[PDB]
Design an enzyme around this catalytic site. Structure first.
Site, PDB file in Angstrom:
ATOM      1  CB  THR F   1       5.333  22.753  46.516  1.00  0.00           C
ATOM      2  OG1 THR F   1       4.704  21.758  47.329  1.00  0.00           O
ATOM      3  CG2 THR F   1       4.727  24.062  46.894  1.00  0.00           C
ATOM      4  CG  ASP F  17       1.321  22.577  43.418  1.00  0.00           C
ATOM      5  OD1 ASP F  17       2.111  23.379  43.959  1.00  0.00           O
ATOM      6  OD2 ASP F  17       1.392  21.343  43.631  1.00  0.00           O
ATOM      7  NE  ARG F  19       1.684  15.471  41.928  1.00  0.00           N
ATOM      8  CZ  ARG F  19       2.069  15.219  40.688  1.00  0.00           C
ATOM      9  NH1 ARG F  19       3.296  15.487  40.309  1.00  0.00           N
ATOM     10  NH2 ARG F  19       1.217  14.706  39.810  1.00  0.00           N
ATOM     11  CE  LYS F  33       1.241  22.040  47.519  1.00  0.00           C
ATOM     12  NZ  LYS F  33       2.112  21.789  46.355  1.00  0.00           N
ATOM     13  N   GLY F  47       8.345  24.189  51.060  1.00  0.00           N
ATOM     14  CA  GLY F  47       9.507  23.833  51.881  1.00  0.00           C
ATOM     15  C   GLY F  47       9.154  22.667  52.758  1.00  0.00           C
ATOM     16  CB  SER F 129      10.014  21.623  43.335  1.00  0.00           C
ATOM     17  OG  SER F 129       8.638  21.333  43.289  1.00  0.00           O
ATOM     18  CG  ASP F 166       8.297  20.544  40.080  1.00  0.00           C
ATOM     19  OD1 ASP F 166       9.278  19.766  40.088  1.00  0.00           O
ATOM     20  OD2 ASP F 166       7.709  20.917  41.122  1.00  0.00           O
ATOM     21  CB  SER F 169       3.976  21.171  40.870  1.00  0.00           C
ATOM     22  OG  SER F 169       4.991  21.903  41.550  1.00  0.00           O
TER      23      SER F 169
END
Ligand SMILES: Nc1ncnc2c1ncn2[C@@H]1O[C@H](COP(=O)(O)OP(=O)(O)O)[C@@H](O)[C@H]1O
Lengths: 238, 243, 234, 204, 231, 220, 199, 99, 250
Positions: F1, F17, F19, F33, F47, F129, F166, F169
């Site tokens: 994320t 993002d 995912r 999100k 989180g 992340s 990442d 993500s």
């Protein structure tokens, strides 16, 4: 008559009738007298029996080694307060390892008895007390009413026909501070005696005496342990 | 919650709510019970035969356990409550103790429950009386009765509800060791007693019987009719052929 | 008008407690006699019908092996106090390994005296006093003792005492015949005599119940035969 | 793992005006199978099914409390539940035990009772909802099912092709998972009917 | 120190009436009048917001309150009680939304509110609310108009009136109003039935109007009410 | 994320993002999100997913009550207070990392809220992340008082950095633009990612799956 | 450690359980009963932790009896099974969980014979036959081999003997005797004990 | 008086009022005497059975029974009849009791 | 506090509970509601008091609450109290379902609610629920059932009965017309239209004045349906065309 049944109801003249009626329950009890020297505090109590084949009601109760009480009123309320006082004394010894000062115990009783005079459907404690004690400030005689008021007395009497005793004590206050124990108990016995018709008098069966002092833990005398006090009195004749 | 004293003392020293509860009982359908040797019979009077009514749903004779049955008179709802509580306790007795339930024990439970409701704040006395009937282990047959006060006693035979005085008098005069010498005779005694208060029918009498370690038996109106028939026959073969 | 259950009269009395005392006057009369040989308790059963099994009338119960209790008034209210007494004796034995003194048990039951009240209390606390008088008869280290208790919570030791409807008469009769050196036989005899005087029905073996507690013998309820042997000597 | 204690697999898949939900039938305790006909898919209305994998106790208990709440809902309001609403209701129910959660990862598949528009979704053990336009999976063979469904699923499928697709996916995914299988059951639901089939599968 | 009276203040009379409820209804039928009309493509609520002096600021308190984005409220009877019920209705609505992530149906909010009202006819130590509510809503295409009274009972109306002179308003509605009415015509007949009582010059600050179409519930601005009151 | 938030001259740009991962498998490729709190307040959540969902719903509810009662627009401080107090009360057991942003009477305001209940008011924030990539993009290319399209470009660039650097993500980029009098909930902004076209046709033909049992239930 | 086993026929349920009550390394009782009557047509076979088995089983028993006394008809074995499973599941996450494994056998006048298996996690599963214990690992397959859904009760007893003999041969735990009961239309019947007269 | 709960005890006390008598609401026998007595002094269709009426109402007193007796009278006088029938009592029962 | 307490849970000196009696009086002034049992179903038919030209009709009924997939109830008295009781009934039935995974027997549902009403009569100092109910249902133990409960928490089973205004008339009429063991849904529907036509103050009787519900058993499922106004008009017409037919005979 609408201001009669509840403690939470002030009367239009500034009084609370359930408290006063409660106070009248103290006059229904047999008389008891309490006086102090400078070293001793003495309770003398006229016990009292229903029928001749029944024992006499006990009137002096032991609270702590330094504090005893004389009761006048509802015995159940008496025992209630008595258990509370014993508990407080034990709590004091438990936490502080010193005997609980009499004035503080009395203050606690005031606090406790004030509460139900302010909440609906609660009733005041129907019992009056004389509290005889000895601490670091000497002997003490205290008086507690159902009104949750208390007084520090130099001598006192409560119960039925206790007015007489009150008068007698009011005469001989000046003697008490220097009396010896035998004379003090005597005075208490005389005060107690004036609270009877000429027909009936003191006996080893209807008298209890209680002493506490600087060299004496609170002690109750009754039956034959009273006889050395009585056999030493002037046969007051009508 | 509601904390008000409903049941208190009257200046003459009576509990008035308990007395009015007992009145409520006095307005109940008549219920009687007699105790036999190997049978105990309880019969209840006016079933309020409305004919469009399911009788099963209005029975006033319930079973508390396989061992104990019970009748009542008073306020049916209060009876339902007391009955269910008693049932729970009958089972919890078997949990806590491998032995079953004695009629005196469950009687004592019910009694205490009613008394509790006579002396708790907020509550109102159950307006019922009960005839508790059973056979204890050891085989002795037992019949007790309770009251809206919480008092209880054992009886040989008794009656509660409307016209309980009449039936009680009759039972006083007719309970013998000759009567209730056979099952057929004890049942007969109860039908005889119930016919002395009932609306004169037979379709307005329920009779239930318990016997030895067997379960409760309720009588179908055919058998009831038969018994009331032999009754009327003996009431015309020993009372007609004499007077 | 409606007042609370915790109201005082101008005279200094709780109306509920008084009314309860009134409620005792309707109970079956009971007699207790204290004696250096033991304490005796008698009570009339007041059977209301020959159909009522009289063995299911117990106005005399065992609080414990050395303490018996005779009750008058509202029996249903008595049951609660009796249970509380039994539990109390057993707790004291549990904790201290010695039996309860009759005075201690008496006191314990008497603590449930004025424990009634509306607001500012538990939802399962009492609504009114106990409409019952008790006579506790026991034997302890002070020997044979007899106590009497009323709904005021006042309990008092008594040599010979009567409670119930015929309280006055029976008490007078008791006063006329009691001395602190009677035998248990004389006590029981006296009790049955006074009882016969005051009872409405004819005194017989299934009409009263009688129990003794003697220092060497646990609480004993007299059987039918044992009663007959005494009633024989009228 | 706790979720692998009983094992099991649940999949749902969208079609044209149809939707499908399948599950294996094994009730097994770790390595051992106890029964082969265990119910994992529960009807929560006509044309709305919920699929529960995970720990079998919480399968049963979540299904039951969901049916509880649902019955109440359908009585208070005079209508069957909408799938979105069911999803949020399940989410609520799971999150109520956020700190001692049910070990189930539900999958919902159903048609909007007003329209006919297919809906599928899945949730966490603590009720995080996740809606897709293709497929959703849950259980011990999640990776497998993802692998098959990414390679088999086409967009606008008719009931027969939805069937073939979800069947092959479940079968081939489940046959590479040790604690899932003992049979496969597939409910393909459309506006007009509901077809329930049990496939021929391996029993090992 | 304090507890709560535990006994019911609302009790059956020998005739079988809950007297306190009828007296509460007497308090309703003494408040300013309010009329509600459900009109095919929406719902109109209007009420008399007539103060007692130029001193009162009419842009401070309102009688037509939103409960959510799609449900609206007016009242007749006591103000404070209405305030309480409105807070509570908003809370209930938000509970429902937390749980179902879907705005509460008007019928369900009416049910819940009514339950609240019924509690104060059986819980201890209280009087019933002296308020009748009119609740408008848009859900599932159709429009919705309910009324809840102090007993806690509720009814669905095509149109109705509450408060003073509610009987004559009701008859006027029965005659001079029917279905196939657009919201505009409904606003018209609402102001028309409110004018059957409004003693004085009906200004744009003497009355308050709310609408509820399938675009959400909203209060009409004083400007819009002036434009409508030009008729 | 990867979620990011920036303050520009006329308001606030949020980015995220799409995912959602369960372990090291993508479970959702199109996760939303960025949560609605109030008409003027939006919140990105990273989180523990469930906890950010339910936290943000709770706060949305209480704020709707609050604006309904006040008759005015919610403030961003109000959301920050509610969130941070609720989160502190749970001692980080509620794994909510949030980027809270909106426009007030006092202007635009961006708070970052950590699960333990700490907040920071900042001109640009990142959480998740992929947060350090995005933060690099900001620390390299941020200037105060940017214009809308510049800010949108910057945010999408930071989210992209997250997406591509990442593994937590991926997929698309969602933006939410909030100004004093406009709300652009662009979803998705720009999908820099496509699944490659299937080269083969593994179409299964009717009857290829063996069936034991069938059961037709007609509806209505 | 304890063994339970249940075989459902077309119109009967056969159940069998070991009769050993063991502590440490010793058998303290050899005529122990694992079975519990709940109704005239329902048996509850409980096994597991020392205190939990009887506490749970007896609790369930009292509640079933209560239902019978409250409603006049008996619970179905299915209603019973779901009842026990609800009670077992509610306590699982509580301070006082119950480690019990259970079978519930029964016969309904309508739906016929039924056999329910319950894990200590409170998962309910209907089965034609099942077993609990370590011994189950050696016996289930035998049942799989020789169970047919049309099996007569005579053949059922014989099959049961096959399982128990297998236990006698391979299992390290002793288990010499087995209570055997059968439930049908007519109620619970006690059959003579399957034993292997060691000493 | 019908309700003795609203009498001052001073009036009920004895001296002032000793014998306190109750009037129960028939049943199945008294009613028979009441019905027979009220229908025995008229051309009551010897066909019908006073019973039907007795077992009819739930707790009808000694009045309601009289009303039914009279009802038929008017029925009788209505359709011009010196000897009432069945419905006449029926209409009466349903005409008086019910209504 | 002692002053303001109306004391609702208390005996009257004759041995009765005043608030319960009064509640029964309240019930007497409510809309008539009756129920007839048959061999192939059971039906409720109730007078509609919500009969005004402006009422919108947004629910499936007015006086017929669906409580359970097998079971439904009608009410008479104070409607809000009926909402309370019906909510609680729902809860009870769903709790049983959650515990036993099978539908609750009607008698247990009725008892469960009746214990609540009784509770209200015995303690708490609250007013009792001014509501009577009729319950119709089916279960695998006793099949089709009709029950009735009063505000005392006291209940009973019937083959046919009525509740509300002019209850006693309706009961008498049913005592005349009922047909133990020989009842059908058709015949019972006729009887319903008859008794409703005679008990309702406003004669002639429009479908706008009555509400009919039937509970029947179709292919293993339980069906509860409220009759559409058309079918009701067919029933009424049938009643009048039978009534004008038996009047020719003279
Ligand atoms: N059993 C009966 N026998 C004779 N007359 C009766 C009977 N029941 C009722 N009545 C008649 O009905 C009337 C009822 O009057 P009454 O008994 O005084 O009732 P109330 O006391 O209510 O006025 C009487 O005038 C009487 O003639």
């Amino acid at each position: 008559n609408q201001y009669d049944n509840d403690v939470t109801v002030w009367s239009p003249q500034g009084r609370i009738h359930q408290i006063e009626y409660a106070m009248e329950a103290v006059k229904q009890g047999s008389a008891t007298v309490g006086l102090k020297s400078k070293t001793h505090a003495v309770l003398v109590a006229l016990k009292r029996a229903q029928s001749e084949l029944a024992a006499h009601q006990k009137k002096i109760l032991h609270v702590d080694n330094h504090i005893g009480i004389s009761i006048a009123g509802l015995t159940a309320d008496a025992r209630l307060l008595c258990n509370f006082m014993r508990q407080e004394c034990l709590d004091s010894r438990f936490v502080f390892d010193r005997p609980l000062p009499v004035s503080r115990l009395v203050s606690l009783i005031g606090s406790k008895t004030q509460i139900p005079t302010q909440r609906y459907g609660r009733r005041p404690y129907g019992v009056g007390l004389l509290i005889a004690g000895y601490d670091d400030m000497g002997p003490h005689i205290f008086q507690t009413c159902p009104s949750a008021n208390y007084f520090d007395c130099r001598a006192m009497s409560i119960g039925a026909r206790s007015q007489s005793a009150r008068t007698y004590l009011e005469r001989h206050m000046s003697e008490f501070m220097e009396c010896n124990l035998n004379e003090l108990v005597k005075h208490g016995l005389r005060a107690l005696r004036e609270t009877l018709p000429a027909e009936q008098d003191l006996t080893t069966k209807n008298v209890s005496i209680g002493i506490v002092g600087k060299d004496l833990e609170f002690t109750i005398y009754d039956d034959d342990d009273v006889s050395p006090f009585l056999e030493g009195l002037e046969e007051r004749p009508q | 919650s509601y904390d008000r004293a409903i049941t208190v003392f009257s200046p003459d020293g009576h509990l008035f709510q308990v007395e009015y509860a007992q009145e409520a009982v006095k307005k109940g359908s008549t219920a009687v019970g007699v105790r036999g040797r190997d049978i105990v019979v309880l019969g209840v009077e006016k079933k309020s035969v409305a004919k469009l009514q399911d009788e099963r749903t209005v029975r006033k004779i319930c079973a508390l356990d396989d061992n104990v049955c019970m009748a009542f008179a008073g306020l049916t709802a209060d009876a339902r409550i007391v009955i269910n509580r008693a049932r729970v306790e009958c089972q919890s007795h078997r949990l806590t103790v491998e032995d079953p339930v004695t009629v005196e024990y469950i009687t004592r439970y019910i009694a205490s429950l009613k008394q509790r409701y006579t002396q708790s704040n907020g509550r109102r006395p159950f307006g019922i009386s009960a005839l508790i009937v059973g056979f204890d282990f050891d085989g002795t047959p037992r019949l007790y009765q309770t009251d809206p006060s919480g008092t209880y006693h054992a009886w040989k035979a008794n009656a509660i509800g409307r016209g309980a005085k009449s039936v009680r008098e009759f039972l006083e005069k007719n309970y013998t060791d000759e009567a209730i010498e056979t099952d057929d005779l004890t049942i007969k005694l109860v039908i005889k007693a119930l016919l002395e208060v009932v609306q004169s029918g037979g379709k307005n009498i329920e009779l239930a019987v318990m016997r030895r370690d067997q379960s409760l038996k309720i009588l179908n109106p055919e058998e009831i009719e038969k018994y009331v028939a032999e009754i009327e026959k003996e009431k015309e073969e020993n009372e007609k052929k004499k007077q | 008008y409606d007042r609370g259950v915790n109201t005082f009269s101008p005279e200094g009395r709780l109306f509920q407690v008084e009314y309860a005392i009134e409620a005792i006057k309707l109970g079956s009369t009971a007699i207790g006699i204290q004696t250096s040989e033991g304490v005796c308790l008698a009570v009339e059963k007041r059977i209301t019908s020959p159909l009522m099994e009289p063995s299911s009338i117990e106005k005399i119960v065992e609080i414990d092996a050395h303490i018996g209790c005779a009750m008058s008034g509202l029996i249903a209210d008595a049951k609660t106090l009796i249970d509380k007494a039994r539990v109390e004796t057993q707790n004291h034995w549990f904790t201290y390994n010695e039996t309860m003194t009759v005075e201690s048990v008496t006191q314990a039951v008497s603590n449930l005296a004025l424990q009634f009240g509306e607001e500012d209390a538990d939802p399962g606390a009492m609504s009114r006093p106990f409409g019952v008088a008790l006579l506790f008869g026991g034997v302890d280290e002070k020997g044979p003792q007899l106590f009497h208790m009323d709904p005021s919570g006042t309990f008092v030791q008594c040599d010979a005492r009567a409670i119930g409807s015929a309280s006055e008469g029976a008490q007078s009769s008791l006063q006329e015949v009691y001395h602190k050196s009677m035998t248990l036989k004389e006590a029981i005899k006296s009790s049955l005599i006074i009882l016969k005087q005051v009872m409405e029905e004819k005194l017989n073996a299934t009409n009263i119940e009688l129990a003794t507690v003697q220092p060497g013998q646990n609480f004993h309820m007299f059987t039918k035969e044992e009663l007959e042997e005494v009633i024989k000597d009228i | 793992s706790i979720m692998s204690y009983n094992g099991g697999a649940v999949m749902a898949m969208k079609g044209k005006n149809c939707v499908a939900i399948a599950a294996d039938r094994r009730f097994g305790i770790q390595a051992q199978m106890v029964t082969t006909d265990f119910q994992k898919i529960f009807p929560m209305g006509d044309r709305l099914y919920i699929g529960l994998a995970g720990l079998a106790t919480d399968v049963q208990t979540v299904a039951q409390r969901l049916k509880f709440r649902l019955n109440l809902y359908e009585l208070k309001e005079g209508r069957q539940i909408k799938p979105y609403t069911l999803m949020s209701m399940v989410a609520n129910l799971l999150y109520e035990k956020r700190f001692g959660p049910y070990y189930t990862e539900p999958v919902i598949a159903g048609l909007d009772p007003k329209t006919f528009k297919p809906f599928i979704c899945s949730l966490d053990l603590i009720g995080c909802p996740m809606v897709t336009d293709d497929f959703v999976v849950s259980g011990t063979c999640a990776e497998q099912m993802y692998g098959m469904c990414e390679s088999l699923w086409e967009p606008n499928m008719d009931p027969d092709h939805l069937f073939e697709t979800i069947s092959q996916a479940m079968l081939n995914a489940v046959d590479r998972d040790a604690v899932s299988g003992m049979g496969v059951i597939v409910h393909i639901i459309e506006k007009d009917k509901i077809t329930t089939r049990t496939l021929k599968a391996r029993m090992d | 120190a304090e507890r709560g009276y535990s006994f019911s203040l609302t009790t059956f009379s020998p005739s079988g009436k809950l007297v306190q409820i009828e007296y509460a209804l007497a308090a309703v039928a003494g408040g300013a009048p309010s009329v509600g009309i459900k009109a095919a493509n929406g719902v109109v609520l209007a009420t008399e917001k007539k103060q007692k002096s130029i001193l009162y600021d009419e842009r401070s308190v309102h009688k037509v309150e939103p409960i959510t984005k799609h449900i609206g409220l007016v009242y007749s009877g006591m103000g404070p009680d209405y305030r309480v019920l409105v807070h509570r209705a908003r809370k209930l609505a938000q509970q429902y939304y937390l749980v179902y992530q879907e705005p509460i149906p008007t019928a369900q909010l009416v049910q819940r509110v009514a339950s609240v009202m019924q509690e104060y006819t059986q819980s201890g130590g209280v009087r019933p609310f002296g308020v009748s509510l009119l609740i408008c809503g848009w859900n599932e295409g159709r429009p919705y108009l309910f009324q809840s009274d102090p007993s806690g009972a509720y009814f669905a109306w095509k149109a109705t009136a509450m408060g003073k002179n509610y009987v004559n308003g009701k008859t006027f509605l029965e005659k001079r109003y029917n279905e196939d009415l657009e919201l505009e015509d409904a606003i018209h007949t609402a102001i028309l039935t409110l004018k059957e009582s409004f003693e004085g010059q009906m200004t744009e600050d003497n009355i308050e109007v709310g609408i509820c179409n399938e675009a959400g519930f909203r209060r009409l601005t004083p400007t819009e009410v002036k434009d409508y009151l030009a008729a | 994320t990867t979620i990011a938030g920036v303050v520009y001259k006329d308001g606030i740009v949020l980015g995220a993002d799409t995912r959602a991962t369960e372990g090291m498998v993508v479970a959702d490729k199109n996760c939303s999100k960025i949560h609605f709190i109030s008409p003027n307040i939006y919140c990105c959540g990273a989180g523990t997913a469930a906890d950010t969902d339910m936290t943000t719903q709770l706060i949305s509810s209480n704020l709707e009550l609050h604006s309904l009662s006040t008759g005015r627009l919610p403030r961003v401080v109000t959301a920050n207070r509610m969130l941070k107090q609720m989160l502190f009360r749970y001692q980080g057991y509620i794994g909510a990392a949030l980027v809270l942003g909106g426009v007030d009477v006092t202007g635009p305001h961006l708070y970052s809220i950590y699960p333990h209940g700490s907040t920071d008011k900042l001109p640009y924030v990142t959480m998740g992340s992929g947060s350090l990539a995005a933060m690099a993009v900001f620390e390299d290319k941020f200037r105060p008082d940017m214009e809308e399209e510049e800010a949108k470009n910057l945010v999408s660039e930071a989210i992209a950095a997250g997406i591509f650097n990442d593994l937590g993500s991926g997929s698309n980029i969602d933006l939410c633009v909030i100004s004093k009098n406009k709300l652009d909930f662009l979803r998705p902004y720009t999908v820099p990612n496509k699944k490659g076209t299937r080269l083969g046709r593994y179409r299964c033909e009717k009857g290829t799956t063996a069936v034991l049992t069938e059961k037709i239930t007609p509806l209505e | 450690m304890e063994y339970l086993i249940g075989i459902q026929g077309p119109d009967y349920v056969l159940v069998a359980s070991d009769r050993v009550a063991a502590s440490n390394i010793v058998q303290m009782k050899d005529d122990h009963d694992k079975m519990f009557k709940m109704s005239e047509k329902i048996l509850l076979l409980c096994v597991g932790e020392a205190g939990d088995t009887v506490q749970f089983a007896e609790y369930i028993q009292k509640n079933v009896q209560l239902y019978k006394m409250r409603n006049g008809y008996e619970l179905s074995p299915t209603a019973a099974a779901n009842f026990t499973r609800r009670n077992l599941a509610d306590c699982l996450r509580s301070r006082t969980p119950y480690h019990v494994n259970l079978l519930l056998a029964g016969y309904d006048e309508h739906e016929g014979p039924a056999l329910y298996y319950m894990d200590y996690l409170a998962a309910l599963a209907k089965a034609p036959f099942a077993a609990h214990g370590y011994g189950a690992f050696l016996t289930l397959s035998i049942l799989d081999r020789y169970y047919t859904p049309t099996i007569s009760r005579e053949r059922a007893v014989e099959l049961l003997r096959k399982c128990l003999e297998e236990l006698q041969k391979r299992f390290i735990l002793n288990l010499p005797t087995f209570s055997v009961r059968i439930i049908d239309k007519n109620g619970i019947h006690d059959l003579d004990n399957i034993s292997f007269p060691k000493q | 008086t019908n309700r003795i709960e609203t009498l001052d005890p001073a009036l009920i006390r004895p001296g002032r009022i000793d014998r306190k008598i109750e009037f129960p609401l028939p049943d199945e026998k008294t009613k028979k005497r009441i019905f027979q007595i009220h229908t025995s002094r008229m051309t009551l269709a010897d066909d019908v059975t006073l019973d039907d009426l007795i077992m009819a109402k739930d707790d009808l007193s000694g009045a309601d029974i009289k009303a039914i007796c009279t009802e038929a009278g008017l029925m009788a006088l209505r359709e011009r009849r010196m000897k009432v029938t069945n419905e006449d009592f029926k209409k009466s029962k349903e005409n008086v009791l019910y209504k | 506090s002692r002053r303001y307490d109306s004391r609702t849970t208390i005996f009257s000196p004759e041995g009765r509970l005043y608030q319960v009696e009064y509640a029964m009086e309240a019930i007497g002034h409510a809309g008539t509601c009756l129920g007839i049992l048959a061999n192939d179903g059971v039906l409720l038919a109730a007078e509609r008091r919500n009969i005004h030209k402006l009422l919108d009709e947004v629910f499936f009924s007015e006086k017929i609450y669906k409580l359970n997939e097998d079971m439904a109830c009608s009410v008479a008295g104070i409607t809000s109290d009926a909402n309370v009781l019906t909510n609680e009934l729902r809860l009870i039935a769903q709790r049983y379902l959650l515990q036993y995974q099978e539908p609750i027997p009607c008698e247990q549902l009725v008892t469960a609610l009746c214990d609540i009403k009784q509770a209200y009569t015995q303690f708490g100092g609250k007013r009792p629920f001014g509501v009577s109910l009729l319950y119709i249902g089916w279960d695998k133990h006793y099949g089709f059932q009709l029950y009735q409960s009063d505000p005392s928490g006291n209940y009973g089973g019937w083959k046919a009965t009525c509740i509300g205004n002019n209850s006693a008339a309706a009961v008498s009429m049913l005592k005349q017309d009922y047909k133990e063991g020989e009842m059908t849904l058709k015949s019972a529907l006729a009887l319903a239209i008859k008794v409703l036509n005679k008990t309702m103050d406003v004669s002639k009787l429009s479908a706008e004045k009555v509400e009919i519900a039937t509970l029947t058993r179709e292919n293993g499922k339980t069906v509860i349906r409220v009759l559409k106004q058309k079918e009701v008009e067919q029933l009424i017409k049938k009643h009048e065309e039978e009534e004008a037919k038996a009047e020719r005979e003279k």
